[PDB]
Design a protein around this ligand. Structure first.
Ligand code: HEM
Ligand code: HEM
Ligand SMILES: C[C@H](O)[C@H](O)[C@H]1CNc2nc(N)[nH]c(=O)c2N1
Ligand SMILES: C[C@H](O)[C@H](O)[C@H]1CNc2nc(N)[nH]c(=O)c2N1
Ligand SMILES: O=[N+]([O-])c1cccc2c(Br)n[nH]c12
Ligand SMILES: O=[N+]([O-])c1cccc2c(Br)n[nH]c12
Lengths: 413, 413
């Protein structure tokens, strides 16, 4: 019938029926196969493609306020013919737009989903070369940034045909800092991008050997070898970190790019797969302040900010780590707000998601949600999301992870 | 072969093989059936009991440094005879001790598991009346408290025979505060214990209508009706909350009991079930400071502590909630330390668990772990546990949840 869901903070109860439409214990696995859509060397079998296509065409037309039956049946016929005569089909622009938003709506790990219907779509399915890709990605970055007034957008490249002509971005994110394995045993920049920074070098990128060196776009088009392209500095907007009280904070010489843009995910819709569809929204403070700046595998600036504050950084029970991390978060929020760059704190983000969740249950009886990702990296139980029981399931359309390109790519020269 | 586990903070990899011995997507469900062992009206079927018994007897003897084969085979024979002639069997004291520690060792939701081998066991299997139960529980509380130098202990009551003579504690925890639905629409005390506080009243308990009113032990013995017993105040040690800087903190008039003792769980071992086996360890600061004091469904003192600090408690982006919660945590840790009562901060707890996890993988190739519970309610990613991929599975011996007694109990008079 349905699965009962309870919120322990407010006591509210919800009835999840949406999970019945799911596709298919692995507790806290980061990249499980269930969330990964790998490569192919052959086209999608027709017996599989068609049911998926029809099911999507039904979902699309069944989403209008007032149904348009005539067009619905006609699209059903045309789609079938297209598959019969070409082996695959082309989505109409409206269907693609609808698909990108739904896939976002169905992202279990996204806290910003209340914004799902507000997405700019850049149709780059006609694209054919890396240079054209690069031009599209620049247009994206420029539009999305909007001089600090960040706008959510997505750029869709040509769908996978036989799997040997995949368009792919080798970058994890569009804008991302380089990480170098410095001489003195240390690490410079972003330690998370170590292996990738090297790959860029192995392809002719000039390592400016620093701290906040924006890495280059590594683009693969039509299954061909990846080409390195440096991002025009004018396009990369950054925020300089300043604390509203600790003047010594700017002495840390920290900053971060204002554009969070996922670049390596695959968009699945109606049997079709889009191995290249970079998308972005805006930042949530804790991502920068807590994960980027404080993870030990990242910038790891925690102890340092502790000392400058004069905390007993040698006694854990003093809760010094709790103290520093909050000041860093305050810095981030203050800096973005001052420099007129869109930012959202985790508390406001949570309430926003909660409101969204409630809208989703009223609108379609469910909201796929991954508690482990939806709960902020700090002040967990202080946010409403923590007390909300959730159901994690994979719907369609959906944004899947992909196997890293350098592991499967067959080189030409 | 095995499941690969990775820690994203340190990069370490672990191979989980222990999950193969497990008994048997529900994301963040609080009380799932997989963790609940319900009631019975008939004895455990022999075809089921015996394999479970033999398997436990093998585990027990197979845990010694140097095996004692002779005794092992003899116990196997005797156990079989006992089941053949009585329909069930009695654990030896050593086996029970071993079982209680293993079940703790196998508690996926416990962060304090590094202490698993340090458990005092009180054999109360000979118990037969509520008065005797009450006396045992008092001896427990007194021993465990040890005048602030908290000691981990467990008291085992008679095992379930036919399910119609179950020994059960109706209390969630041994020491717990009452919650009253005051006149003025508000709530007094602990809002979590509302329904239960009433039940105590419906059984003759005198509602002292306050804030920190220690509730009474509601004991069910031999399947008979529950009897109410007030806990001797001298036994209940408490800590008064004091901030080392904000002198106005004591004006809040807050405190908390120093003894965290789970009272409603069922111990499962070798086919046998113990519906009454209260146990305790020591507190982890955030439990009191964050959950008990700050959950909106609990004491909800967050805004109040914010005001006293002079924070913009009307602007979420100011991160005022993050500020208050940390001071409360500092208060708790400071108070317990000052009053010489055992307490542990969440940072030290995490490192402790991490060390434990590593010992467990080296010792037996696994450690059942529930990430959702193991990660502190604040400073999530700041703790090592957050970056540790985990596997959640149910082993045996194990501590299960039970269906609340008032929902299934058949009243006599
Ligand atoms: C408008 C503001 C948005 C905010 C504040 C937001 C925030 C976030 C956050 C905090 C995460 C977790 C990231 C991490 O920890 O690695 C996330 C994940 C995700 N978001 Fe959103 N998001 C927004 C817009 C979008 C858009 C426009 C899309 C897609 C059309 C999207 C798709 C996703 C997906 C697929 C993930 C998973 C990424 C992964 O698994 O690594 N988000 N987002
Ligand atoms: C020595 C110190 C110990 C510490 C610091 C510790 C701490 C904790 C914490 C923080 C939780 C989560 C509680 C909650 O959020 O409701 C927990 C759960 C648990 N602990 Fe430990 N524990 C300790 C000892 C013990 C002992 C001695 C046992 C049993 C023999 C035990 C059994 C469990 C079980 C079964 C749970 C799950 C409770 C539930 O699901 O509601 N703990 N413990
Ligand atoms: C091991 C664990 O799954 C991993 O470290 C997580 C957990 N929660 C997360 N939540 C978010 N938002 N982002 C993340 O990267 C992670 N990583
Ligand atoms: C909904 C969610 O499962 C619930 O609120 C949780 C999550 N994490 C927890 N973790 C601990 N330690 N204790 C808890 O009570 C909970 N409750
Ligand atoms: O805001 N964030 O922290 C954040 C993190 C990771 C991916 C995205 C996207 Br797409 N929008 N916002 C994001
Ligand atoms: O320390 N704690 O926060 C805590 C919470 C809940 C149950 C227990 C036990 Br048993 N020991 N410590 C506990």
């Amino acid at each position: 019938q349905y699965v009962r869901i309870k919120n322990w903070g407010s006591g509210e109860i919800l009835h999840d029926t949406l999970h019945h439409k799911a596709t298919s214990c692995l507790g806290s696995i980061m990249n499980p196969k269930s969330l990964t859509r790998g490569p192919r060397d052959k086209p999608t079998p027709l017996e599989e493609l068609l049911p998926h296509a029809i099911e999507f065409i039904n979902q699309y037309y069944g989403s209008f306020k007032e149904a348009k039956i005539e067009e619905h049946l006609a699209r059903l016929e045309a789609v079938t013919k297209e598959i019969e005569t070409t082996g695959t089909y082309q989505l109409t622009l409206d269907e693609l737009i609808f698909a990108t938003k739904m896939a976002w709506r169905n992202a279990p790990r996204c806290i910003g989903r209340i914004q799902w219907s507000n997405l700019q779509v850049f149709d780059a399915r006609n694209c054919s070369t890396a240079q054209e890709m690069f031009q599209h990605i620049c247009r994206h970055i420029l539009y999305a940034t909007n001089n600090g007034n960040i706008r959510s957008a997505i750029t869709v490249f040509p769908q996978r045909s036989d799997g040997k002509h995949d368009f792919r971005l080798w970058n994890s994110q569009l804008i991302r800092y380089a990480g170098y394995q410095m001489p003195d045993g240390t690490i410079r920049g972003d330690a998370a991008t170590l292996e990738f920074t090297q790959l860029c070098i192995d392809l002719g990128w000039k390592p400016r050997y620093g701290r906040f060196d924006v890495l280059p776009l590594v683009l693969q088009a039509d299954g061909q070898d990846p080409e390195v392209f440096e991002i025009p500095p004018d396009l990369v907007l950054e925020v300089t970190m300043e604390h509203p009280k600790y003047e010594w904070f700017q002495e840390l010489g920290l900053k971060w790019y204002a554009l969070p843009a996922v670049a390596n995910m695959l968009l699945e819709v109606g049997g079709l797969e889009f191995p290249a569809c970079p998308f972005n929204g805006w930042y949530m403070g804790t991502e920068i302040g807590v994960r980027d700046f404080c993870d030990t595998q990242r910038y790891n600036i925690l102890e340092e900010v502790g000392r400058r504050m004069g905390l007993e950084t040698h006694t854990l029970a003093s809760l010094w780590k709790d103290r520093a991390v909050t000041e860093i978060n305050v810095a981030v929020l203050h800096s973005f707000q001052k420099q007129n760059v869109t930012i959202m704190d985790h508390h406001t983000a949570s309430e926003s998601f909660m409101k969204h969740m409630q809208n989703e249950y009223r609108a379609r009886g469910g909201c796929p949600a991954d508690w482990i990702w939806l709960v902020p990296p700090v002040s967990g139980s202080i946010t409403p999301v923590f007390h909300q029981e959730m159901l994690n399931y994979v719907l369609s359309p959906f944004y899947y992870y992909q196997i890293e390109p350098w592991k499967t790519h067959i080189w030409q020269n």
